[PDB]
A paper describes a structure:
The 14-3-3σ protein, which has multiple interacting partners with specific peptidic motifs, was used as a case study. We have observed this phenomenon first-hand with human 14-3-3σ, a protein which has several hundred known interacting partners in the cell. Furthermore, different isoforms of the 14-3-3 protein are function-specific.
The second step involves, after these 14-3-3σ–cJun-pS227 crystals are fully grown, displacement of the c-Jun peptide via addition of the desired peptide for the final structure at high concentration to the crystal drop and incubation for a period of time until full occupancy of the peptide is achieved. We have found useful criteria to be using the peptide at >95% purity and performing the soaking at 277 K with an incubation time of one week. To demonstrate the experimental reliability of the method, we considered this approach for peptides found in the PDB where co-crystal structures were published with isoforms of 14-3-3 other than the sigma isoform, since they were not able to crystallize under the standard ‘sigma’ conditions or any of the other hundreds of screening conditions tested. The new strategy that we present here has allowed the determination of several new structures of 14-3-3σ which had not previously been possible, illustrating the ease and success of the method. All models were determined to belong to the orthorhombic space group C2221 using Zanuda.
Numbering used by the authors:
A (entry chain P), D (entry chain P): 205 to 209
B (entry chain A), C (entry chain A): -4 to 207, 209 to 231
Write the structure that this text describes.
């Protein structure tokens, strides 16, 4: 659920 | 392989068309062919390589999560047994995902990383190595799960050391690397406090450097908002 | 082929998982294997077959349109020549799309249509035949374009005759068939007046039949709104 | 641009 880039 | 007969410039041009067409499988195969030409990649070609496989593996990870959830519900008390089909198909998608990750790691090892001398190329590829070991770690369960996690951690750590020495705190590659390493700590290494400390420190240090163009300001603050978003999720 | 070793019920179960996972290539291969088992399909299995290939060919059509547009701009006055790459890649996607259409038409011909005796199955497969010849017609340019259009028209017309004799005007298969035949007239056969007449007549006749369950009411009116939408676009 | 179903 964490955002990566 | 199949792209051996096509010119490098044509593979790059067709990779850009495939992106416009949202044909990310084509795009990755084109970019894999361009890499296998043996020449180092420009910054724009590195970004195309990244976009193509991120989209390929991103669809596989989304499907794996849908199937793993169905499978876990199937293994609870009171759930009726439906045969091996859910595990079989989850395994099928999982094997495909691992194959793409191995393909990427193989390109990085032969021979993108060993020829990257500049900070921007070397940190970019080491971050990619960490990301794709992390995608392997998401689905690992056997006796290699510890070693997969440590390969992800090692590649991220090497990229961090270079980026802190060689890049400003606002550099998008440095920011994106720190974001993903923080996601590694939180989601993979069961180190949510290390994730939060890394995200807060990375954000504050970029904030103090913003005063040094409006175009680069927009690039950095975009990634800082992702750090902010995660911090809000995590605390 | 590759699904020959898997049970029919397992292919169906895995097709439903693939849909949940948005893995439509898998879904179509599973459903192609289930068809090749040689047994007729239930209404639910026909819908799975339809959903799988609609999504596969729908992505290919979207990509083909992006590439065909780029290609046409490349062929205007003042546009710089970029080599054969755009035409090559447009041709690559086009050939893949035609291959999927041929696969579907092949399943219908061997042997889904000849074994379908009920109106609901026979109209469903003849509508599919018309749809996939229509997708071939979208990209046809050579000496077969006339014959492709007429194969689409013939299959649609046969399905229409059966559906008017055998089904109520509100039946979703009859409604969806008339909608797509009207799209054929407007977009393929250069007959926009025939498209509009068909859409208005189909809508009015369904409207007069709605009074005959709330669940079926919702199913029919959903498709009637598509007819309405098109009429608003076309007039 | 027309809708099909
Ligand atoms: Mg080749
Ligand atoms: Mg604490
Ligand atoms: Mg088999
Ligand atoms: Mg008129």
């Amino acid at each position: 659920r964490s955002a990566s880039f | 392989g199949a792209m051996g007969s096509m010119e490098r410039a044509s593979l790059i041009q067709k990779a850009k068309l495939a992106e416009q067409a949202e044909r990310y499988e084509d795009m990755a195969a084109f970019m894999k062919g361009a890499v296998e030409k043996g020449e180092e990649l420009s910054c724009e070609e590195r970004n195309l390589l990244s976009v193509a496989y991120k989209n390929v593996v991103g669809g596989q990870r989304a499907a794996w999560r849908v199937l793993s959830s169905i499978e876990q519900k199937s293994n609870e008390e009171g759930s009726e047994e439906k045969g091996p089909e859910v595990r079989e198909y989850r395994e099928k998608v999982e094997t495909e995902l691992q194959g793409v990750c191995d393909t990427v790691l193989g390109l990085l090892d032969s021979h993108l990383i060993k020829e990257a001398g500049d900070a921007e190329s070397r940190v970019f590829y080491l971050k990619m190595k960490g990301d794709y070991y992390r995608y392997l770690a998401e689905v690992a369960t056997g006796d290699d799960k510890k070693r997969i996690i440590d390969s992800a951690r090692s590649a991220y750590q090497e990229a961090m050391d270079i980026s802190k020495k060689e890049m400003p705190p606002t550099n998008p590659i440095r920011l994106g690397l720190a974001l993903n390493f923080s996601v590694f700590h939180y989601e993979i290494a069961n180190s949510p406090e290390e994730a939060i400390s890394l995200a807060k420190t990375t954000f504050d240090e970029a904030m103090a450097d913003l005063h040094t163009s409006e175009d680069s300001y927009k690039d950095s603050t975009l990634i800082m908002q992702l750090l902010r978003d995660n911090l809000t999720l995590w605390t």
